[PDB]
């Protein structure tokens, strides 16, 4: 790999610099290199990994949605403009699928297999569901098997998180948020999405009294994200 000659610590250092500079493609390349050194990631390092690729694929998805909307308008009275729109939508789509494949490969080689603690195993299985979900957004003979891969990854994370984490754990809450949106807009199951967001919110609310002040800024953010989705869907 291109990062094979760089020290692990230097890669982590440079991923943090790329974060400050909003250079997320670099940040992702540095963390991929860090993963490929073969050592487990710490908590802070897991977050660098997920933020980096979340922003890369996020930009690819937003641009894919722009082009797809134009493509759909070109198939309504619309004047033939040629193959360029489909071609460029495909170009962005293939790049997007490539990043998703790269992230799924890191998880498979070998992050998930070596993660024993719940905080890491759930984190990586959530990521697996996320990037299979992103593949499902653009799938049209294959969508069903990609959707089931995402659900299977989410479901196993859900099982572990319920057994091994408190209801206020930020990873458990963030998993539930994304698995609920999976139900809503991918798996055509809005009632399951609503039920999941409500029980998740309600069970974390009941657990807040156990928590230190200002030690759960991320959990409180995600609870508001659950509440926002519910208001939008009901």
């Amino acid at each position: 790999g291109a990062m094979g000659s760089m020290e692990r610590a230097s890669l982590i250092q440079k991923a943090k610099l790329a974060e400050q500079a909003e250079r997320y493609e670099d940040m992702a390349a540095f963390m991929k290199g860090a993963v490929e050194k073969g050592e487990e990631l710490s908590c802070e390092e897991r977050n660098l990994l997920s933020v980096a690729y979340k922003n890369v694929v996020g930009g690819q998805r937003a641009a894919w949605r722009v082009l797809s909307s134009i493509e759909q308008k070109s198939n309504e009275g619309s004047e033939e403009k040629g193959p360029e729109v489909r071609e460029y939508r495909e170009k962005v789509e293939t790049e997007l699928q490539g990043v998703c494949d790269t992230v799924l490969g890191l998880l498979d080689s070998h992050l998930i297999k070596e993660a024993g603690d719940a905080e890491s195993r759930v984190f990586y299985l959530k990521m697996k569901g996320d990037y299979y979900r992103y593949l499902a957004e653009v799938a049209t003979d294959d969508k069903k098997r990609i959707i089931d891969s995402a659900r299977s990854a989410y479901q196993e994370a859900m099982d572990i998180s319920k057994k091994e984490m408190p209801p206020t754990n930020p990873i458990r809450l963030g998993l539930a948020l994304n698995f609920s949106v999976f139900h809503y807009e991918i798996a055509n199951s809005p009632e399951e999405a609503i039920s999941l967001a409500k029980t998740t919110f309600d069970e974390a609310m009941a657990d807040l009294h156990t928590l230190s002040e200002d030690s759960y800024k991320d959990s409180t953010l995600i609870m508001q994200l659950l509440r926002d989705n519910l208001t939008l869907w009901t």
């Binding site: 963030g174 994304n178 949106v181 809503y184 995600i222 994200l225 926002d228 989705n229 939008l232 869907w233």
Partner: peptide, 5 residues
């Protein structure tokens, strides 16, 4: 604008 994280 549903949220994911």
């Amino acid at each position: 604008e549903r949220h994911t994280c």
